[PDB]
Amino acid sequence: RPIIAFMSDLGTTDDSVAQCKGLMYSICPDVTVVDVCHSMTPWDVEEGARYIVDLPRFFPEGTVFATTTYPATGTTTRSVAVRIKQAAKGGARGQWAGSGAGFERAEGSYIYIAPNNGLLTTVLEEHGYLEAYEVTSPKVIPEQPEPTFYAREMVAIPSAHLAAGFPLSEVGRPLEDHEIVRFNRPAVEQDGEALVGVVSAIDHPFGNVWTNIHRTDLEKAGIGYGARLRLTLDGVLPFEAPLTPTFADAGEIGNIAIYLNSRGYLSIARNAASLAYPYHLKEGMSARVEA
Amino acid sequence: RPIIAFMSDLGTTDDSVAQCKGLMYSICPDVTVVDVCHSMTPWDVEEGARYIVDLPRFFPEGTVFATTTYPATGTTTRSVAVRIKQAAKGGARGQWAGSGAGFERAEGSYIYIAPNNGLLTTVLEEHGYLEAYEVTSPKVIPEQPEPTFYAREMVAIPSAHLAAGFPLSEVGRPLEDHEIVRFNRPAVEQDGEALVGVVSAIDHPFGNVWTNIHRTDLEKAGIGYGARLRLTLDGVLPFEAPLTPTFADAGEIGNIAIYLNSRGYLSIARNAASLAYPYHLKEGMSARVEA
Amino acid sequence: RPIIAFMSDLGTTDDSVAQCKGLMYSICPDVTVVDVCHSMTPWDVEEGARYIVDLPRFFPEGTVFATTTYPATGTTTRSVAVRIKQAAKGGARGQWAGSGAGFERAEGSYIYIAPNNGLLTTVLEEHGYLEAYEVTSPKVIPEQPEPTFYAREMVAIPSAHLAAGFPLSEVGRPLEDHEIVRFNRPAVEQDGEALVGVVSAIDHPFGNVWTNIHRTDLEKAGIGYGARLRLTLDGVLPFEAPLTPTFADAGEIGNIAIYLNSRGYLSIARNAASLAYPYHLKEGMSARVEA
Amino acid sequence: RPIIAFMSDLGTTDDSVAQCKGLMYSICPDVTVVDVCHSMTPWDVEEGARYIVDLPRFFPEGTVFATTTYPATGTTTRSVAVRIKQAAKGGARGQWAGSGAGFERAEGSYIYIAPNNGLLTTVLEEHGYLEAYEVTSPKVIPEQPEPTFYAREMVAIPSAHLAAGFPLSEVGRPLEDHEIVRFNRPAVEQDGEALVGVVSAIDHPFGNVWTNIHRTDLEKAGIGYGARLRLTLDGVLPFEAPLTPTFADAGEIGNIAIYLNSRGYLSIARNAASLAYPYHLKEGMSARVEA
Amino acid sequence: RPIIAFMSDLGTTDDSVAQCKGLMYSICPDVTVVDVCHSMTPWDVEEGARYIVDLPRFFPEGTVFATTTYPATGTTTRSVAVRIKQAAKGGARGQWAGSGAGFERAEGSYIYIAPNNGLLTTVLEEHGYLEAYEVTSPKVIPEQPEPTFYAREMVAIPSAHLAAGFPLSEVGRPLEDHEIVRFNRPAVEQDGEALVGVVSAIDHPFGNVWTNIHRTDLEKAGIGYGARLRLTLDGVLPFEAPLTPTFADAGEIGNIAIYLNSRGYLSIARNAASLAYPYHLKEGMSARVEA
Amino acid sequence: RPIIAFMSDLGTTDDSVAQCKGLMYSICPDVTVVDVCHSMTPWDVEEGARYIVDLPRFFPEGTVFATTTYPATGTTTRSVAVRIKQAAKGGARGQWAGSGAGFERAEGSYIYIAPNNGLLTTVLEEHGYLEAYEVTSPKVIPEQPEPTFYAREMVAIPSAHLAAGFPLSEVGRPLEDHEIVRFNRPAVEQDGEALVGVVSAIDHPFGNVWTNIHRTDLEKAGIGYGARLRLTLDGVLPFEAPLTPTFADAGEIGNIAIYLNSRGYLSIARNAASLAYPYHLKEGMSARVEA
Numbered sequence A, B, C, D, E, F: 001r002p003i004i005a006f007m008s009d010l011g012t013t014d015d016s017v018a019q020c021k022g023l024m025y026s027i028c029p030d031v032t033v034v035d036v037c038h039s040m041t042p043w044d045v046e047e048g049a050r051y052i053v054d055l056p057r058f059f060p061e062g063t064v065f066a067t068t069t070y071p072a073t074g075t076t077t078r079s080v081a082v083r084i085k086q087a088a089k090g091g092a093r094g095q096w097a098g099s100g101a102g103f104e105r106a107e108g109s110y111i112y113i114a115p116n117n118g119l120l121t122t123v124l125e126e127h128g129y130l131e132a133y134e135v136t137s138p139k140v141i142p143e144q145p146e147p148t149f150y151a152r153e154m155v156a157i158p159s160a161h162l163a164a165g166f167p168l169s170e171v172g173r174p175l176e177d178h179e180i181v182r183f184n185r186p187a188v189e190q191d192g193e194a195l196v197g198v199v200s201a202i203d204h205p206f207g208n209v210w211t212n213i214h215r216t217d218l219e220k221a222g223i224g225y226g227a228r229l230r231l232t233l234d235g236v237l238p239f240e241a242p243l244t245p246t247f248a249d250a251g252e253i254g255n256i257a258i259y260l261n262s263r264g265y266l267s268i269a270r271n272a273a274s275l276a277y278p279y280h281l282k283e284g285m286s287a288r289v290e291a
């Protein structure tokens, strides 16, 4: 029962994703295409990375992640197809996903195929990989790929072959690690006792604010649940609350919750109210937290 | 061929829905996950209710409706899983859905799993239920649920177990009726001969205006198709049109149509033009109807 | 493994599409419903046409395209169901879609079912058709169709019967060609040496500008890749670039690329930057091009 | 104590009006410059006309109205300077302005100087004129006028000479009536008993809606204060109220007032609430009124 | 050399203010009309109050303040004309305005004429009054006032008579104190050691945030310059800065300054950046201060 | 008859300017205060400079320009008061302003008083100065100036003393040239034959685009009226038109006019249509021009 989980910047306002899906069903008749999302900021490889990094543990083993923003479409660039190593635990706590104790996933159980443009940076960081290949075989990509639609040609199409059981090592030549493009992930710096990062994302549609300050950055600073925090956003907007597991811990609706999100990072929200929207808080604003 | 029809407030801009779906396929490999919608106003249980109440008759019997906005995520709250009684006719007329005379649906043929937060108020109102259980079993929910992600932990996960044939009564303790949280559904009042309600929704993306004045409410006044109505929105807009079956009955494009929507409610629109958008009409504005 | 590819104006903000899908799975238990998109401008038949015309070559043979904007919902109008002739090559170059040399699609391999309101004009233009029928049989549509929901009653539902193998010729009487409503496709005019058309679409979410000036119109002017072009939008913006295969050919990020999009049309973008959005360029603006 | 009352489209965001004023004080040291307004929609001669037509009765005799939108600036066009005849009563009732019984103004007591572009159409209609001259004398305009600033050169400057006592007949040659450009003022038509006009203006900053239906159009239709009116706006938005002298007559705050504005025209408003803004009502929308 | 300082809600987008001014010059030929502002929120008497309360010390003795938002226009209501008592010091410090030690203003040296709608509440509070009269005499108001234009009829006109030396006591009957309408000025409450008020205004066009926590309120807590304050806006923004005299005291551009504004009120801003606009801070949001 | 022409960033939404005016009339009873404008972008000294540099030739000799954006308000900074040298011709052509051959202005005839923050940079550049003084004397500024209102304390107030005939040299110590803060005026660069500058301003309310490319820069390139120009905005919009004196020279309404504005600068507009607004063109965008 092959799955392709499909994350793109293609949007859902035209038939672009459907073209890809048509081809996925063409190539892998029995496939299930799962949309991850298609609304990532176009060409923002770091943002795209966020939508795909945590996926493996939730998916059945053998799932192929077709993940693409492809601003280098139509160039001599070729996608990378990698088998990841650890499906990797996640969340505020770091666990296997699912009922009971969760579902453990065997190593080497997921393939990502993406533009070799750094999209997979954090996937590779968090999961490691067992093998990586340049996607060049005309068995898995068009001989004449549409210049402006490498998302389809060099990701959707070959992901469907991979889902169909096309041997990964046959999509093209092995890539050495240095040949896998990566983006530099900005460090959470320590400025005194304070951890200084950025708003990594606004958690739509809630307006929760996610920072790139991980629980590990917090552990590394001696802050666990219950710790009274000052979280300053945008070097202007100050917030103060204990670190709590969840939103309702803030008490009243609208109260500030500082918490660890489901991806494991320091975040801030109002309890059942949007924090980000009324204040127009945005991804990329500084996030400083201090006890 | 089990189906989970999934309605959440999770949006489609990140991988949150995909995480739930990954887990649904993990748990119930042969499941078809049908998106209901994921764009509901977060935490607005009355709005969420509107997207799920009409669903059963459309779906094959045995469908599980995983329906969730979960502001109380991470609290001691637990979801409720209910087997509804009547699949219930619907529409302007009140009929089975489908070709011919429609597909009659057996009773007790659908399960809803939702936060016990009132989301299912109108589902229970319109369909009744045969049994309801608190969702507590570690067989169907994580032993260590992600605090901020009960949509996944307490709805998506257990829904897939239910879709996989996990016995409903084994999800947890039977809930007594009074233990099923309900929201108060504001009544359509009679102010003289006029029926007084609200705009229940703007019917996106058309900008049609839906009221909570149901066909049955109109029948209480003997208002049927052909009746020349004054529909006053926001207190000051005495729209006038006969009640007609459809938009084109208004005649010229842009003409006011007063009609019964597909959910059976008194609605107002322009014929092949947006009524609500140009004039910024909104849910919650008063609506009054009379002949 | 039947597929219904479903393109509507229903949006994805409520359960409307899900109701259609529920019925599609009810009627055709084995079906895979692939969303094309549901965000088309309501009632804009010409725009809806763009999202469906290029679909066939992407999909497995036997796919049914349920394509609908239905402003005449509730009227005596009835859908048209057509078996197209040529799946037809497409793209900047004009080729079969897929890996290798692409997937050749047999003739007569796809059915569209749509309102008979011109939605299928370009489908018919580009693919031809072998047979067209009015969709009237209560075997494939409701006896009492919901007045305001013909998208479901007269498209979704019968599309699922067609997917389920209901004989096309049994949906109703054959339509003669003149009975299939067409919209007039505005011609690309020659104004001297310049080809004059319109911005056909803003390519969301990138803000690329698509014109209705086809590759064929360009190679009729001796315009091929490498030609230095002046492309004037909205009658005042005389962008200049060579015609290149792709965005990155513009060089620096933000530079103007004039290219043939994946649908084969003269288009203009910035390289990995939005062209349309900063300047609020829009569909329907004039588009002039000269070598 | 000479007054120039100055109405332009120059805005108040830069020093444009100040340049004009500087010159007015240069030429007429003892002048008082009164700003009428400078925010009229640029080049909208009909809208500009509204801001100047009612002015004379409020001003001391001898006031010069410098009134300008000048889209033909820098052309061979020359301003017209006219001495009006009747200062003319105004208002909902038609009276002299001021305390007691008002201040009667002698005939021939005001000069307008404006581009000869129709700006003065309604001034001439409502007031008549005694003499009109083309403004060409280098005694009153620059020998080398700034091409893009005829508002200054051909209106502000010569208005200051006129205020200073420069003989009007000496600014240039007499204009025959046909040489005074006029705009066609759209008629309030009778469609049955209903009077059909347009929203002439949104009365900022209140959001009151003014129509071009005059009390005389209403008198001519048998509607005076107390008459129950239906006023339909934009051929969509319907309103109903008696014709009342004022806003507070509507009763509750927010209630619909249909009234005659201070310029004498049928208008509609909410009582101490904005009508136009929440509904995005605009100038140019149809205004149909019926009893 | 009489001055009328004119504050209305009339806006500057049409000729309404000019009509009033024309009449002011008609009645008092030698008057200087000073615009205070005309952009106040219509009908918001508390906001209007803020624009007029601080005016007297700035103006030459004998200045008439014509101050008006007149929602009760056209009713039996009549304006009030008051001679204030103390011109009153002001500012962060509480001082006479002007160079050197400032211009001391005699008592009883200013008249306000306003609707008797509470607009003068804070004027009377902060300045006291010596006499107050209802404005009823046809010597100073129209015998037939334009119903919808009492700003002109009952304020502008009589103000000019007052400016011309019309005896104040002759405008009409003396009003007893209780006959002068007042609005309730919400108190700055003490919630522990914190002072709890509201954002009284956004200081346009800078986006500074003004509170109704006056210097005198801070003095009640012994809060002076240098005190490290927590200023919480909207309930969740614990701004922290010392109370400083000015913006630049915050140091770097964009740093938070907590200060006493020129009206003497606790305020918060960024240094040479907008505080309110980026975060959409608004009048009426809660404000709390403590050391 | 002294004049103070007052340009500030104070806006016109509150009584701030009126307070300044009150004091100006207090200090200089005979003065006429002419508003230049009060809407300049706060703290933008370069933009403020544009509104004041061209003023002198328009005003009667002896005019005082009180020009202020004062982000250093409340600091030890003190205003500069300068007597300029040349009133200087201006416009597209470079001429005295006024009727006939214009009004020649004697040298040393105008005083500017401003924060010493570079606001006067272009004033000094274009007019030169004869004398400059630091404004420190308590005869012309408050002994205890309001910390946050130096616009009033250090500009308005002393400007009125200067208007009143207070000797300029007595306001404080002479400033040496190096003590008068200047901003760096970005140069118009030559990039080949093309002149490269910036959009200096959007000319509101018309949406004309002004560049910092001066007539002098054009006639140094042999560019005069009639020259066919390519003017590229924002690095992507290569508008083409001949250089013409005025907007109407573009022909049809909406056509592109490239012209020299009234300040003498290369500008681009549409003929009686907004260029800047539809395309959201902005100050600071690159502006390139070539013959």
Ligand SMILES: Nc1ncnc2c1ncn2[C@@H]1O[C@H](CF)[C@@H](O)[C@H]1O
Binding pocket: A008, A009, A010, A042, A043, A068, A069, A070, A071, A072, A073, A148, A149, A150, A151, A152, C206, C208, C247, C248, C269, C270, C271, C272, C273, C274
């Ligand atoms: N203007 C664009 N520049 C660079 N890449 C673009 C642009 N528009 C779309 N794309 C990319 O094309 C990929 C299809 F293969 C899409 O997913 C975009 O990332």
Ligand SMILES: Nc1ncnc2c1ncn2[C@@H]1O[C@H](CF)[C@@H](O)[C@H]1O
Binding pocket: A206, A208, A247, A248, A269, A270, A271, A272, A273, A274, B008, B009, B010, B042, B043, B068, B069, B070, B071, B072, B073, B148, B149, B150, B151, B152
């Ligand atoms: N800020 C929030 N406050 C309360 N609940 C929230 C917030 N943000 C998201 N949620 C809920 O978390 C659920 C996942 F379990 C989402 O569906 C939200 O309803």
Ligand SMILES: Nc1ncnc2c1ncn2[C@@H]1O[C@H](CF)[C@@H](O)[C@H]1O
Binding pocket: B206, B208, B247, B248, B269, B270, B271, B272, B273, B274, C008, C009, C010, C042, C043, C068, C069, C070, C071, C072, C073, C148, C149, C150, C151, C152
């Ligand atoms: N206001 C409307 N006028 C005409 N058609 C409409 C309107 N709103 C929705 N529709 C059509 O109803 C169809 C379902 F049958 C939707 O797909 C809309 O096209």
Ligand SMILES: Nc1ncnc2c1ncn2[C@@H]1O[C@H](CF)[C@@H](O)[C@H]1O
Binding pocket: D008, D009, D010, D042, D043, D068, D069, D070, D071, D072, D073, D148, D149, D150, D151, D152, F206, F208, F247, F248, F269, F270, F271, F272, F273, F274
């Ligand atoms: N783009 C423009 N086209 C035509 N007229 C314009 C344009 N911009 C400004 N103006 C007119 O110039 C007059 C100055 F004399 C202004 O008052 C505008 O009406």
Ligand SMILES: Nc1ncnc2c1ncn2[C@@H]1O[C@H](CF)[C@@H](O)[C@H]1O
Binding pocket: D206, D208, D247, D248, D269, D270, D271, D272, D273, D274, E008, E009, E010, E042, E043, E068, E069, E070, E071, E072, E073, E148, E149, E150, E151, E152
């Ligand atoms: N819609 C309105 N309701 C009540 N008062 C209003 C309305 N529009 C304007 N006004 C008042 O009329 C006054 C002139 F006398 C204006 O200053 C408004 O306050």
Ligand SMILES: Nc1ncnc2c1ncn2[C@@H]1O[C@H](CF)[C@@H](O)[C@H]1O
Binding pocket: E206, E208, E247, E248, E269, E270, E271, E272, E273, E274, F008, F009, F010, F042, F043, F068, F069, F070, F071, F072, F073, F148, F149, F150, F151, F152
């Ligand atoms: N937030 C502010 N930072 C620095 N200066 C400011 C701020 N708000 C207002 N100002 C200046 O105060 C001056 C009056 F003296 C105003 O003109 C602003 O320039």
Ligand code: MET
Binding pocket: A203, A204, A261, A262, A263, B010, B014, B016, B148, B149
């Ligand atoms: C915190 S609510 C759960 C969904 C959310 N978008 C997340 O990924 O964590």
Ligand code: MET
Binding pocket: B203, B204, B206, B208, B261, B262, B263, C010, C014, C016, C148, C149
């Ligand atoms: C308005 S046509 C059908 C779709 C609509 N949202 C409905 O539920 O009735």
Ligand code: MET
Binding pocket: A010, A014, A016, A148, A149, C203, C204, C206, C208, C261, C262, C263
């Ligand atoms: C612009 S890159 C590919 C997606 C685009 N919407 C297309 O149809 O070609």
Ligand code: MET
Binding pocket: D203, D204, D261, D262, D263, E010, E014, E016, E148, E149
């Ligand atoms: C109706 S309130 C008075 C001012 C308004 N703008 C008018 O001209 O009538």
Ligand code: MET
Binding pocket: E203, E204, E206, E208, E261, E262, E263, F010, F014, F016, F148, F149
């Ligand atoms: C903010 S600087 C001075 C102007 C301000 N609006 C005030 O009244 O204090």
Ligand code: MET
Binding pocket: D010, D014, D016, D148, D149, F203, F204, F206, F208, F261, F262, F263
């Ligand atoms: C654009 S026409 C005249 C007004 C313009 N703001 C200028 O300074 O030239």
